[PDB]
JSON list of C-alpha atoms in Angstrom, two decimals:
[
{"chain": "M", "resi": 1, "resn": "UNK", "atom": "CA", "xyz": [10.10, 20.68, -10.38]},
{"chain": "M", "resi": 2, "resn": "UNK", "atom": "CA", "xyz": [12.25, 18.19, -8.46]},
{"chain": "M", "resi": 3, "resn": "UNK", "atom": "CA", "xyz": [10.84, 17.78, -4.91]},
{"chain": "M", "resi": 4, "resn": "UNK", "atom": "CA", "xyz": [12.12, 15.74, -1.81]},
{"chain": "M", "resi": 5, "resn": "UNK", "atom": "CA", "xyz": [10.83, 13.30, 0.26]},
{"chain": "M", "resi": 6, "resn": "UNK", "atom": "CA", "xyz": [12.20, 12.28, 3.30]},
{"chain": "M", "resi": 7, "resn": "UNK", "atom": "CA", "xyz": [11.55, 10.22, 6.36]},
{"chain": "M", "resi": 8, "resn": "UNK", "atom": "CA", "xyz": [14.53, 12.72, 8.38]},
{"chain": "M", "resi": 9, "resn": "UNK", "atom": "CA", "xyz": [14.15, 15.69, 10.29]},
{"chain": "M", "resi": 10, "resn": "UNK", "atom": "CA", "xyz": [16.23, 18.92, 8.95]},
{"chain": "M", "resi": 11, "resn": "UNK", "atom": "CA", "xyz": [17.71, 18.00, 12.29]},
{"chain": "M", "resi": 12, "resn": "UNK", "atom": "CA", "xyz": [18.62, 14.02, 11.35]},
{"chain": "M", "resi": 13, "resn": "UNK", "atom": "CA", "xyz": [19.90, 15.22, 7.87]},
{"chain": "M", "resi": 14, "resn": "UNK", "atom": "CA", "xyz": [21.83, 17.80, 9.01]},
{"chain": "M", "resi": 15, "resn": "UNK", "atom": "CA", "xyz": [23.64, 16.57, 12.13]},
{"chain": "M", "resi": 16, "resn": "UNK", "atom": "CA", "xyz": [27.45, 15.69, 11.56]},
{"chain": "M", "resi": 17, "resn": "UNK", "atom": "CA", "xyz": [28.13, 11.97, 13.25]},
{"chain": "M", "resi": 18, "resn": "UNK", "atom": "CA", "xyz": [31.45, 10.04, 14.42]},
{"chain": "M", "resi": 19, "resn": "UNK", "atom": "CA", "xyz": [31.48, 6.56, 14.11]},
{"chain": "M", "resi": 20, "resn": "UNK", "atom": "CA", "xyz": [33.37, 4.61, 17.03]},
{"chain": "M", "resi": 21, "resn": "UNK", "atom": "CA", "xyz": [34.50, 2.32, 15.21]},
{"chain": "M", "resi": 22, "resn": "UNK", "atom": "CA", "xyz": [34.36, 3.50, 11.36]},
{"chain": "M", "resi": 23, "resn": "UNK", "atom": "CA", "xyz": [33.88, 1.54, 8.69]},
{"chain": "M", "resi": 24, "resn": "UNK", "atom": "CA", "xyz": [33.80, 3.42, 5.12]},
{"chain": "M", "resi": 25, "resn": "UNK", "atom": "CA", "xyz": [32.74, 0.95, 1.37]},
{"chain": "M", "resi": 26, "resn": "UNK", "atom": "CA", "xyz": [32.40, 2.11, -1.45]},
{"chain": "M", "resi": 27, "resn": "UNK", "atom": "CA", "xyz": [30.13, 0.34, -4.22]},
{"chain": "M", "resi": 28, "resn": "UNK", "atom": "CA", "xyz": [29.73, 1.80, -7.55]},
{"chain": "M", "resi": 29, "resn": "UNK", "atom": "CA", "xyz": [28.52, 5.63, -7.33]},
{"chain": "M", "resi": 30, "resn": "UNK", "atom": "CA", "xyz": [27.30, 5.01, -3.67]},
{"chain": "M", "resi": 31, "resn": "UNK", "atom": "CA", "xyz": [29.29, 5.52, -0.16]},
{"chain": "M", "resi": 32, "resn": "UNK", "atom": "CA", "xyz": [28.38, 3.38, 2.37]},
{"chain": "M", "resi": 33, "resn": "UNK", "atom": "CA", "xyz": [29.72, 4.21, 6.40]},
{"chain": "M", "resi": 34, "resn": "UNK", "atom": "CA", "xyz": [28.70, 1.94, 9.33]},
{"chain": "M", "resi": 35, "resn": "UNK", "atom": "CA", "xyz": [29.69, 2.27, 12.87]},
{"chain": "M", "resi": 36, "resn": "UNK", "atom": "CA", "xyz": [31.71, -1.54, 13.51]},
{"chain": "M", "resi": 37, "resn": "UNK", "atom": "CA", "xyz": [31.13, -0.65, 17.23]},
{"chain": "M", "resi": 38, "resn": "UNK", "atom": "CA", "xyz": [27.67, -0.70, 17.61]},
{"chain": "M", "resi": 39, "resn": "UNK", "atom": "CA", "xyz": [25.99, -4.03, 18.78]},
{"chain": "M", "resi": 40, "resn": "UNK", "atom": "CA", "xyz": [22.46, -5.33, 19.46]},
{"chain": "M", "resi": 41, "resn": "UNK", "atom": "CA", "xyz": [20.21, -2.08, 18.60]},
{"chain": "M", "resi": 42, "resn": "UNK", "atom": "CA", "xyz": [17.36, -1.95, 16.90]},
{"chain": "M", "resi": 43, "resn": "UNK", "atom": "CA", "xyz": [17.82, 0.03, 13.67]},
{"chain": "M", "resi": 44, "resn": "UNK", "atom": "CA", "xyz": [16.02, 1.86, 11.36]},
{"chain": "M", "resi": 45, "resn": "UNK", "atom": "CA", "xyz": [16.93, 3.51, 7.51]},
{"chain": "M", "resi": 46, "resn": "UNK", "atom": "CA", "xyz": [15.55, 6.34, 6.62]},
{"chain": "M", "resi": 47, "resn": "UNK", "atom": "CA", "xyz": [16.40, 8.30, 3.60]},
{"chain": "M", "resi": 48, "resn": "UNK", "atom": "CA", "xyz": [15.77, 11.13, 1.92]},
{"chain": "M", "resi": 49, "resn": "UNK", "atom": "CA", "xyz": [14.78, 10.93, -1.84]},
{"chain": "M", "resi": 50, "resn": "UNK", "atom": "CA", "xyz": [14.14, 13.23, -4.89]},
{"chain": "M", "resi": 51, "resn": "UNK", "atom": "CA", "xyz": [10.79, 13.12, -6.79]},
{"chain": "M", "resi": 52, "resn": "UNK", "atom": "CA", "xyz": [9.42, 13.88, -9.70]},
{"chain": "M", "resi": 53, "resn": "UNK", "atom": "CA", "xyz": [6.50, 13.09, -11.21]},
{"chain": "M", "resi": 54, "resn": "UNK", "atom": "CA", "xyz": [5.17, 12.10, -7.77]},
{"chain": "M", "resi": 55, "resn": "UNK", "atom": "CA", "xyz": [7.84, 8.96, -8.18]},
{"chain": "M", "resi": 56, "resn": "UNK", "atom": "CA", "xyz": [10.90, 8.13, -6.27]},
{"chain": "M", "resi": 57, "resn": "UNK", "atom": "CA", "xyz": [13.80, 8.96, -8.55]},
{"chain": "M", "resi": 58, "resn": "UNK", "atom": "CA", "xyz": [17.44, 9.37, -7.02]},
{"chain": "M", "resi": 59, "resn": "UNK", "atom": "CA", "xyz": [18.79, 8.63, -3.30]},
{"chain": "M", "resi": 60, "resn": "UNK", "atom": "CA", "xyz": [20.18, 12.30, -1.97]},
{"chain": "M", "resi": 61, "resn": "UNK", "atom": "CA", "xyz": [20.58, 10.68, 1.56]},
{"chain": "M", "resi": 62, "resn": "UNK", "atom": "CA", "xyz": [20.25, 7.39, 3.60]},
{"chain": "M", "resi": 63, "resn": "UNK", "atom": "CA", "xyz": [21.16, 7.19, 7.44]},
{"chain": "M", "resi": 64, "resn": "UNK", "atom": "CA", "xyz": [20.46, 4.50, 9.76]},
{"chain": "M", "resi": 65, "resn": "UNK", "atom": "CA", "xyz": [19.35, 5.38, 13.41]},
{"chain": "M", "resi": 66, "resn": "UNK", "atom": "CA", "xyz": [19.27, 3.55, 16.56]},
{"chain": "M", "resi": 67, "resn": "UNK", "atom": "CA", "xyz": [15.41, 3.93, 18.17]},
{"chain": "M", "resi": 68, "resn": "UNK", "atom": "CA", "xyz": [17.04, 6.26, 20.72]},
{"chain": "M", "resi": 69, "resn": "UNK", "atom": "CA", "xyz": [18.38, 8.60, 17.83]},
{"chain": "M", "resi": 70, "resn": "UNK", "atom": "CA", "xyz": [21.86, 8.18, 17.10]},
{"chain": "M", "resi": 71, "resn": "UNK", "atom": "CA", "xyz": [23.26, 7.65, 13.98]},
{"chain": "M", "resi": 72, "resn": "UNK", "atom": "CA", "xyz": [25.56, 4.76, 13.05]},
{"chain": "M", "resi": 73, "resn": "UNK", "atom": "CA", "xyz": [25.14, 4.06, 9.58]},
{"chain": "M", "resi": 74, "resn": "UNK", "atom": "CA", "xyz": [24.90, 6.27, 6.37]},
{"chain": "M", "resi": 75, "resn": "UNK", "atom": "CA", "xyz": [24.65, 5.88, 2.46]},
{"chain": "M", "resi": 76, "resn": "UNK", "atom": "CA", "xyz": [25.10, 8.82, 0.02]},
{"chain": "M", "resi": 77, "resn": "UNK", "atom": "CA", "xyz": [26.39, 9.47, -3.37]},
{"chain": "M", "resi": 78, "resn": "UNK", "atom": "CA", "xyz": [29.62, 10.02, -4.41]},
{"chain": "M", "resi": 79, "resn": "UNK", "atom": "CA", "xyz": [30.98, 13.55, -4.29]},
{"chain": "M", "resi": 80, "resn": "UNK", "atom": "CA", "xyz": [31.79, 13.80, -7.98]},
{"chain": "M", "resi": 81, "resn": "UNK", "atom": "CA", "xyz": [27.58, 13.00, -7.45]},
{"chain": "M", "resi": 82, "resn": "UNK", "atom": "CA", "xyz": [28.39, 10.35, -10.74]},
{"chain": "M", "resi": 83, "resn": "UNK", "atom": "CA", "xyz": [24.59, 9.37, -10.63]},
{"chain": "M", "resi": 84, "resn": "UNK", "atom": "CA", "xyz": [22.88, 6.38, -9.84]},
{"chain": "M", "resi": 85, "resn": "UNK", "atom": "CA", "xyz": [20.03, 3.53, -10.71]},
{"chain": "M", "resi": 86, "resn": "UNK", "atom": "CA", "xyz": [17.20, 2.01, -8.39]},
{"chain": "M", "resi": 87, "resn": "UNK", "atom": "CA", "xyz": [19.41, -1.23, -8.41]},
{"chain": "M", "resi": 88, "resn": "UNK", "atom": "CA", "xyz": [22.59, 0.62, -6.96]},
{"chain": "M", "resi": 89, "resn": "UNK", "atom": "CA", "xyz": [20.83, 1.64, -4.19]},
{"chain": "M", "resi": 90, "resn": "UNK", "atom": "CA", "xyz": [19.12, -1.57, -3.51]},
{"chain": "M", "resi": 91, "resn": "UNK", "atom": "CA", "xyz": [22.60, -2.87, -3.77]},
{"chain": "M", "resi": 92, "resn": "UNK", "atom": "CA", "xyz": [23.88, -0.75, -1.40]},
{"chain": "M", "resi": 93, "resn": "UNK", "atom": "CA", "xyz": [21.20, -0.85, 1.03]},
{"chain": "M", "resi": 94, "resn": "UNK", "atom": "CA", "xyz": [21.95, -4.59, 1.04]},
{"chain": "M", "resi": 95, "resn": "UNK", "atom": "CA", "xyz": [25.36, -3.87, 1.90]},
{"chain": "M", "resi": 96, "resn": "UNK", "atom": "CA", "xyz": [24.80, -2.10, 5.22]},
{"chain": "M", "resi": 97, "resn": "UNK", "atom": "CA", "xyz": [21.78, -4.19, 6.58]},
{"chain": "M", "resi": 98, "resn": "UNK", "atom": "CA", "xyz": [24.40, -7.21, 6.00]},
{"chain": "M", "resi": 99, "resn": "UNK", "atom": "CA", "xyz": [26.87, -5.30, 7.95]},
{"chain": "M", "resi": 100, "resn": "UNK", "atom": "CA", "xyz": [24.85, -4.18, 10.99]},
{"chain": "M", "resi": 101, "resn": "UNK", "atom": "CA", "xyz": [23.36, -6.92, 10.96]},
{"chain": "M", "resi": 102, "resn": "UNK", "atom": "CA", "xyz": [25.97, -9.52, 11.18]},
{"chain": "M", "resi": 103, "resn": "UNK", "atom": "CA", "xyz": [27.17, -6.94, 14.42]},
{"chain": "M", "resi": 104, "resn": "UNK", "atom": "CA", "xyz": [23.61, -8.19, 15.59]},
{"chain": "M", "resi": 105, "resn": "UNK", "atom": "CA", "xyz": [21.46, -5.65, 15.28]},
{"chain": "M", "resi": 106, "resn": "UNK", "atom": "CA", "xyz": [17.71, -5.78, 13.73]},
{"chain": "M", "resi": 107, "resn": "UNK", "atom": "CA", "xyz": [17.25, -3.12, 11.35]},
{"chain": "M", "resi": 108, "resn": "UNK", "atom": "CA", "xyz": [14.33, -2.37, 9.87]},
{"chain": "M", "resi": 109, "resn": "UNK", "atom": "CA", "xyz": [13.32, 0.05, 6.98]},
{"chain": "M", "resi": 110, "resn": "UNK", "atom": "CA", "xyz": [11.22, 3.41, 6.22]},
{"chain": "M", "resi": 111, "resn": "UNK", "atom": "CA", "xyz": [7.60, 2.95, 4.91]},
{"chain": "M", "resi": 112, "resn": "UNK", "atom": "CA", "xyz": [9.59, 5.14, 1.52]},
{"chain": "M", "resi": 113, "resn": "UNK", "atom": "CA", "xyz": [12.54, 2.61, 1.87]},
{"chain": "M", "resi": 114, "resn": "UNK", "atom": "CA", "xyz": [10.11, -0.21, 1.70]},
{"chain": "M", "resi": 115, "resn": "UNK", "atom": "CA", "xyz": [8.50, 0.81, -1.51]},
{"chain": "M", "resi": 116, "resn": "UNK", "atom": "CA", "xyz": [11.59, 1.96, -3.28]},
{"chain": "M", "resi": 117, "resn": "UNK", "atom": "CA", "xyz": [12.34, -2.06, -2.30]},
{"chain": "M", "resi": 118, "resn": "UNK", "atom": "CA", "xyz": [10.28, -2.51, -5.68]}
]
């Protein structure tokens, strides 16, 4: 069976977010949304992955979250859910850590984040 692992609460995953200042990219099969407003936080990704065979196989969801809780970053798959590799979701993890933080922020990844990494 595929399984889920996930460094979010139900809560986290759940909870719908505005971003002051939205920014929306896509690259390849992967959505990426960052909040443009948000300035000198510390950051972390977490993300919620499915397993099987006790290994890490597709992204289901990626937000980013200020150490106070709020969200203001996000990375999921496409609607049409088109499917992805390891390498588009490095790619696109990439993507928002640029963009948060050339806004100045230090972000920081999940202990799962960090050994999806290789």
């Amino acid at each position: 069976a595929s399984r889920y692992l996930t460094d979010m609460t139900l809560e986290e995953m759940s909870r719908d977010w505005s971003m002051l200042i939205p920014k929306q990219k896509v690259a390849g099969p992967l959505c990426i949304r960052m909040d443009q407003a948000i300035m000198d936080k510390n950051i972390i990704l977490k993300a919620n992955f499915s397993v099987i065979f006790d290994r890490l196989e597709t992204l289901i969801l990626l937000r980013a979250f200020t150490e106070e809780g709020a969200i203001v970053g996000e990375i999921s798959p496409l609607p049409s859910l088109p499917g992805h590799t390891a390498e588009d979701v490095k790619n696109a993890v990439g993507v928002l850590i640029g963009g948060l933080e050339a806004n100045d922020n230090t972000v920081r990844v999940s202990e799962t984040l960090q050994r999806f990494a290789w």
